[PDB]
Structure formats: structure tokens, C-alpha cells
């Protein structure tokens, strides 16, 4: 019963548009130095007029406090194969969603909507431990009569210094060719290299150590304009030069950025590991398959052509000095049926490039039993059986698993996927992959889509929405998401518990059993955050 | 707490997705004979995989039962200028909202969404009085085994038998336009004419007695594709030979329709009566304006047109008996201070056609006491001014008026809007006029919209989500809406109280004192409908 309300939220819960006013006139965080943290400003006007609403802080300029506003999304259902108590915004959803975050201060706002703006601090390492407090206050009108209200933060910075987090590395398969689509830009055109650019950048700034490199076009599908950065002609049958120099630019440029590791393509097409790779050249204007769309991944011609490339990929990563902080891939998620198929591609690998060591998605534990990928990076639901095993490994989530499992999607609650780090670390992973970054567009078809409408890559229910992307295509890069916001702070809590010697078997780890089991409670969060931020 | 929940919802609460399910299993109707009535079947699934769900009825026959699907459409925000206690689906809404009907009977349950099929039942002349049961069957799938539930329905029917709507007449100004850009076709194609044909049925089954000529195309913008069914061609420079051949097709195909009366499009351009009509000639494949657009409305140029059209308009009305049968509009919405304009485009029509009565929505009242028009139309916000001098005259709504007003938007409760027709009846209402029937692009501009994402012509909050179409474009012609339909029942209730011979003064419509101030509670309108149906 009051014309506006204000209030301030942790950014671990959702502000649906249906949901009631607060009052939480104050609000108290917890901060290590050389780091960041997040909070909202929610707001519901109470009038049928509609106004403008505008939100700034005072008080916090060392803090270096940056303001976007939390846009919606359409979302058609909830995910499938996940039970209520999993879903966040039970009474809520299907419905209008936060996830978006905008550049923008001043926005509209609309009659009994309910809706927030984002703030991100920067902690900065040279400043006194204690509690900084500061004022963010929110300016509305209410007929022709300005109004304003100021709300108060306060934050206990601690001793706590984040140190640069160390032996785990985060991947994220960012997609060029979605670059491509979204905007309407020639592959590699300067409009896609300061996309790219402003891409990677966002990537390193979340917790991405470690820069993708398209070498080659990742998917089955054929497409017109292919993500290939390994430029490939054929002066004559069967000879290939190589061109190396768009590599050669995003290497050096993801180096500047501040990555060291580096991530290849796979050299054999997926499911089966059955198919070579879809290598194109240059012909006139158009791109074409240098060989046949059915070509197999022991044909003569692929083997000819591997006997040129990997040698020659051999000789750039060792002029560069990229060879030890360079992952490879052969093939993804092989089945146990062509297990054979992989370990002659492996066999040839051998034989071809001796020097090249395999990571590669592989959730059946009789796989890295017998070390044929030399990293193997199981599905988290496979990663307590290659824990009996002890064979140290990455983890992955893609779509699946889901209900008590751990994931990012649109219906995941953000506690339970702030998770994230914690579980990383406690269960003593070597690395993260992902490949829904900016998946953009439409899934297996050279068809751009709408991220700001479409949330699964038009494949719902088999792709879950927000499982493609954690960004969204905004005019000169990516836009962050609350999720993506939220898994970042999952990291720097990951960080947290590096800089600050706490062990994997400490007590206050204990209840994380699994990827599956394990408390999804902000009140967790938040007291062993505290804990650690004390004794420090 | 059960896999599945269906229950029976009557056809005038919405169902929203993240509404409670219920557990209604019986549901008693009451209507009239020669009448159509309506209800809803719901359900909610209450398992995290996808299934699905069959609708059909059983004992139903001699009913014609007709079985929709509920679709949903996405709406941003509410209505401007509405109080909460006015709204509907408060604390479900900004959201998905049920509006578009859908020709399937079948579909996919969602998980713990609260969806619902639309059906209509034809209670027919003959039919014996008393009271009729029938069934609805839900056919659904739980893992792999079949389950399915038997609802009960009642209907109790009065010996009543509805007589066609006398002397009140509806009409709403579909867009042929609207169908040329829509389904891209060439204007007045095979095609367009099959689709226009579609929307004219429709129109008449919903209880729309008049049929829209857009003789000229209405709009003050300039398309390159208009809308203009009157063929003019210029042999000599100002001489307009005219071909009515379209119009005749359309008057033709109407008739058969059941058609009666005919409504002919505007000559003066509106806001101000000052501008003449775009009228266009074609120049081989492209439609050329006559004329400047900064046209005069009182220019030689425009004069000199009129006299020419006028005598040739009345030609075509003798020729096809419409003189006594067609409506005529003069210019839209003229302000208070246009009224001089009005007078003088008014006279110039008496010296030039002194046989034509004149029709416009009128709002001020000084149009009506001075009979600057024949037929006032004024905005039912002006209603009992025009009330209070016993000036008879049609009422009309357009995005406004708002709040406690009867309306027709997407917020508008359905309660409200079913009081349509009464507040028509005991308000001695001439006639209703709609501006928007299937106003489906982009406000003033010849762009096409999406129906099924955008509600408001992309004007909101300008236009209102829900005024600029009730129906919505499926592949072979309108598809229904929950609005369209409690509309249809709501002039079907005109019919009712005309039927049975209830006086606007007897004490049941007591209540209903305004446009703005009568009952809005399903209760009231199933309670009176009891009181005429038991009588008699």
C-alpha cells in the first residue's frame, strides 16, 4: 500500500514480475579483496500511470560500482526431468524470467512489475579490512513530483586477498560462427575480430582460462560460411598449404587479453567417432568441402591430409610456444561401440603425432581406466565412478543431468548453482568445460535465432533453455546474464577457498558428497562464506 | 497431489499457467435454445516428463461440440490506467496469458503448467427443454501405461428460443490490408479473397450484423499496397471513371453470408476533418496516389472528385440495393475543436449527396444536439451525456477509456467484458462499433506484425495489449480468442434479454447505472440469467 517500493536483495534470488514488494531497507555483504560481488536494487511501483525509475550509488567510488538493469525473457515451460523442490520460481514460472543484464541506469517502470537492477563492485586489494558502507539511492516520479529513496549497503571487506586461481582451468567452446549469424558479419570480417575480441574478454573476465581455438568447424552440418580459422588451400590434388595467421591473430590477441592456455578443435566428427573432419577451402567466394561429407576418418584422403597437418600444427605451436599450454581434442562422448574406432584414431594419432595429448569428453569409466584419452573429462553424473577409480579428470554439464544435479540452466536456483566452485573444488576436479557459452543461434542448421526470445536453441525440451548460452548478443558484444554473473562468483568462490588454505577434506566441506548431493541453501552459503572471511 | 489434474472451469475465469490446480468434477451450464455456449476443460501435469494429452466428448453429439486448445501469448506488462481491483490475473501476470483458440484437440502436457481446451456447444432450436448430460473424456500417458478420466457436464436448457438480434447492430472495421500483409499475398488476390471470406464468416457467427467496405483505404499513411477496394481510373487529367467490380464481389460474397447491412469507409482524413482521402490509381504494377497527401479537404481537387464519385456511388447503391441498408462515415474521431471542419465537409456532403445520412464516433456532445451527424457515435466515456439529452446514437471502445470502463483488453476480466452486451441493452445503445478486429501489423506503417508475440500494434502503452485484434491469423483463416468468444456470448445475451421481453428499466438491470459503473462478478450474470431462464 505505498505508491513505489524499493528494496535491496542478495543476488542469489529471483525477482519475478509477479511477486510482492519487499521493504529490506538495509542490506550486509561479505567481500574478499581482489575480488567482486553483486547485489540488487528491486523496485515495484504501485501506480497505474506508468513512470521512470533511476538508480545510482554515492558513497562508492573506490568501490568502482557498476549499474545495469535486469532485463526478462520469455519462458515458454519449465525444463523436463527436474522435480518442483530443483525449480527455481515455483508459482512463478512458466513466465517472464531475469536473465539479461542491460547497460542502463534509468528504465521504466511499468504499473505492479516488480523489477531490479544489478550492481557489481570491484573489492580492490589496497583497501582497509572493515566494513565500507555506501548509499544507493533510487529517483522516481509520482505524477509531475520527483521522489527519491536511499538505501544502505554495507560490506565487511576482509584481511582475505584472492590470489589468481591456480591448477584448475576453465573452457568455454564460444562460437564464431554464432558471431556470424547474430550480426550479419563476413567470418572474420574487423566487425567479427572486436566481437571475437570483446568475446574472449568477457570470458577471462567470468573465470575462462582457457581460449578455444576453432581450427576447425566444429559441427556435422555443412555449412556456406564455416568457423575455420586454419586456412586451407590446394594448389594441387591432395596438397594442402596451411595459413595460420587468423590463429596466429587470435592467439596473440587471447595472450594480451591474459590467457595462456588454449583449446583445440576435434580431428574426427562426433558421435562414432566415425567421420572425418569438414575441412573447406576457399573457392572463388565461397567456402567447399575440400572432400566428400561422408569421407571416413581412415579414408586415404584424411590420412594423407593428417599427414600434412599435424606436423605443420606441430610446427607452429612449437614457434609459437604454445605446445605445453595447448589442449587437444579427437573425438567427443565416444559411444561403447566404437570404442575400436577411437582407439585406431588414437593408434593413428600415435603414429602421427606422437607428441599430441587427448582430452576428450568420455562419461563410461572403462575409457580412462585404460588411459585412452589422456585427460578424460566425464559428465558430472560419471564423475563419483571415475573418483572410485581415481583417475584424476575434468567435469562437464551439458542439458543433462538435471533435477538434484548440478547445472546452469534458466529453471536451476541460483544458490544451488553459486554451487558450482564449491563442488569443483571439493571433489578435487581438474577443469570445467562447457560448449554453451553464446550458442546462439539454431541448433545444427546455419540459421540464426533469437536469444532474447528463444532460450534452447529452438530444440526445447532435448535442450534445455539456458543451457546454449550465458550471454546474450548485444550491440558491441556480449551482454552478461545473472547467470553468468552468478557461476563467475561460483568461481571466485573456488578461489576463495584456494587463497585461503582450506582443505578439500575440511569439515566445512563435508555435506558436498556428490554433484548431486549436496546443500543448495543461500543460508550456507552465506555462514560458511562467513566462517572463512572471519578467521582469515 | 495426483500425476495429473483435470478439472472444469466455466468459460469466463482465465486459467494461467502457474495457477493451483483444482478439482471441480462436475460443472452445470445453463443456456437458451438456438444459442451457443461455452466452458473449459483443464489440466495440470504434475510429472517432470513431457506427456501426452487427448481431449474428446462423449454423449454429445446432437450438441455439435467444438474442441479448442487455449493457446498462449506472451504479454510484457499490464495495462496502463487500471487499478489492481480492475485487473485481471493479478499475481499471474505480466506473463503468459490464454487468448488464441486453436483447432487441435490433442497436445502436449507441459510440466506443472496449468493449460486448458475451449470448448463451445451449439444448443439447438428443437432441442427439448430440461436439463442434458454429456461427458468429457481426457485421454493422457503416465510413464507407459494409459490413463484417462471421465468429467460430467450439465446442461440445464430453458424453453426459451432465441430470436435474431433486432434493431442493435455490431460492427467492427476488419483490415484487408491486414491480410495482404500478414500472409503476403498481392492485395485482392485469390488468396486474399478466400481469407477475407473467412473473416467476414467469422464476423457473423460472432454476432458482427454489418460489413466493412474499405472503399477507400482508411489510413492516413501512404502505403505502397493499399487497401483501397473502389478500382479509380484518371483517362484525362481529373476525369475518374470508377470500377466497383470488387466491391460488388465482395457485397456478393457477404450476402451469401447471411449479410445484411454494409458500412462504407471514411471521406474526410480524421483529426481535424481537414485532409481528403488517399485515393489511388494503378500506374502498371504500382498503386499511385491521386494527389498530393497534403491534400485539402476542401481543395477544388477534392471537390471536383466528390462530385464525380458521389452521384456515381449513389448509382451503385440503386444498381445493388443497398441505399436503405448501408452506413455512411463522414471523418473519424473529430475533436471539440474540429466541429467547424465537420460542419463544413458535413454541408458540402448535402449539396452534393443530400440522399446520405452520415455516421461517426463523436465523443463531444455538441455533435449530437446539433445533428452535425445522423447517427453519433460517441465513446462510452460520453455515453450518459448523449443518455441524459435522449439523443439516440452507437457507443464505441478503442484503447480508452481504462480502469472501472468496460473494455475488451487482454487484463480486462472476463465478467467485465461478458457485461458487454447487457450494458448495451438496458443503455438503449443504437449499435456497437470496434475499431479492432484484426488489426495485425504495425501501427501506421506498412510493416507486418506477429499477432502471436506483439498484442498492441507495438504501441504500448499507447494502444493497449488486446485492442487491435481479437482474433488471430491461422493458415487458412482467423483463429478465434477467449475474448472473441465471452464477446459473442456477451451480444448473445442482448439477444436473451430482448428475447424474452425484459424491459432496460426491469429491476434486475437495476445495477447497471453506467459504462463505467454496473456488476462485474460471474455470480451476477449467472444468477440473472437464472431469474429470465426459470421464467420463461
Known amino acids: 500500500d505505498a505508491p513505489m517500493a524499493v528494496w535491496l536483495q542478495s543476488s542469489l534470488q529471483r525477482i519475478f514480475p509477479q511477486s510482492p514488494a519487499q521493504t529490506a531497507a538495509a542490506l550486509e555483504l561479505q567481500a574478499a579483496r581482489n575480488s567482486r ?98 548509499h544507493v539511492r533510487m529517483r522516481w516520479q509520482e505524477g509531475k513530483e520527483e521522489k527519491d529513496k536511499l538505501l544502505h549497503v554495507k560490506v565487511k571487506v576482509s584481511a582475505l586477498v584472492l590470489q589468481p586461481r591456480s591448477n584448475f582451468h576453465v573452457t568455454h567452446w564460444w562460437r564464431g560462427e554464432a558471431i556470424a549469424l547474430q550480426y550479419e558479419t563476413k567470418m572474420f570480417d574487423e566487425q567479427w575480430w572486436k566481437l571475437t575480441r570483446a568475446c574472449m574478454k568477457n570470458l577471462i573476465e567470468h573465470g575462462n582460462d582457457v581460449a578455444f581455438i576453432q581450427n576447425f568447424f566444429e559441427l556435422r552440418a555443412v555449412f556456406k560460411e564455416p568457423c575455420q580459422m586454419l586456412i586451407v588451400r590446394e594448389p594441387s590434388p591432395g596438397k594442402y598449404e596451411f595459413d595460420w595467421s587468423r590463429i596466429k591473430r587470435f592467439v596473440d590477441m587471447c595472450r594480451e587479453l591474459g590467457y595462456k592456455k588454449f583449446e583445440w578443435a576435434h580431428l574426427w566428427l562426433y558421435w562414432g567417432v566415425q567421420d572425418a573432419m569438414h575441412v573447406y577451402k576457399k573457392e572463388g567466394n565461397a567456402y567447399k568441402l575440400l572432400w566428400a561429407e561422408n569421407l571416413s576418418g581412415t579414408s586415404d584422403t584424411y590420412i594423407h591430409f593428417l599427414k600434412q597437418y599435424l606436423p605443420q600444427l606441430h610446427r607452429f605451436l612449437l614457434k609459437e610456444n604454445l605446445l605445453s599450454d595447448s589442449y587437444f581434442h579427437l573425438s567427443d562422448e565416444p559411444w561403447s561401440e566404437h570404442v575400436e574406432n577411437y ?156 587463497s585461503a588454505g582450506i582443505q578439500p577434506e575440511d569439515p566445512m566441506l563435508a555435506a558436498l558428497h556428490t554433484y548431486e548431493d549436496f546443500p543448495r541453501s543461500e543460508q550456507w552459503i552465506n555462514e560458511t562464506l562467513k566462517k572463512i572471511l572471519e578467521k582469515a
Chains 1, 2 share one sequence.
Request: glycine letters at 6%; aromatic letters at 14%; hydrophobic letters at 35%.
Open 343 to 498: 582407439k585406431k584414431a588414437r593408434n593413428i594419432l600415435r603414429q602421427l603425432a606422437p607428441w599430441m595429448k587427448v582430452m576428450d569428453a568420455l562419461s563410461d569409466v572403462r575409457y580412462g581406466r585404460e588411459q585412452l584419452t589422456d585427460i578424460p573429462i566425464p559428465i558430472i553424473s560419471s564423475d563419483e565412478a571415475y573418483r572410485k577409480e581415481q583417475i584424476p579428470h575434468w567435469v562437464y554439464f551439458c542439458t543433462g543431468p538435471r533435477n538434484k544435479w548440478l547445472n546452469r540452466l534458466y529453471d536451476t536456483p541460483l544458490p544451488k548453482l553459486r554451487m558450482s566452485g564449491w563442488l569443483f573444488y571439493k571433489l578435487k576436479a581438474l577443469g570445467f568445460l562447457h560448449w554453451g557459452y553464446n550458442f546462439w543461434y539454431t541448433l545444427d542448421k546455419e540459421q540464426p535465432g533469437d536469444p532474447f526470445t528463444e532460450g534452447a536453441a529452438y530444440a526445447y525440451p532435448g535442450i534445455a533453455y539456458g543451457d546454449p548460452f550465458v550471454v546474450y548478443p548485444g550491440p558491441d558484444g556480449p551482454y552478461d546474464s545473472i547467470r553468468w554473473e552468478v557461476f563467475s562468483e561460483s568461481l571466485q568462490d573456488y578461489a576463495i577457498l584456494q
Open 37 to 134: 560481488v553483486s547485489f540488487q536494487v528491486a523496485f515495484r511501483s504501485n501506480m497505474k500511470d506508468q513512470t521512470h525509475i533511476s538508480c545510482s550509488t554515492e558513497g562508492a567510488e573506490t568501490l568502482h560500482p557498476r549499474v545495469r538493469y535486469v532485463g526478462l525473457v520469455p519462458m515458454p515451460h519449465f525444463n523436463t526431468d527436474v522435480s518442483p523442490e530443483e525449480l527455481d520460481g515455483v508459482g512463478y514460472l512458466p513466465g517472464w524470467l531475469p536473465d539479461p543484464l542491460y547497460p542502463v541506469t534509468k528504465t521504466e517502470a511499468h504499473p505492479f512489475e516488480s523489477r531490479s537492477f544489478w550492481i557489481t563492485l570491484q573489492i580492490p586489494a589496497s583497501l582497509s579490512p572493515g566494513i565500507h558502507d555506501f
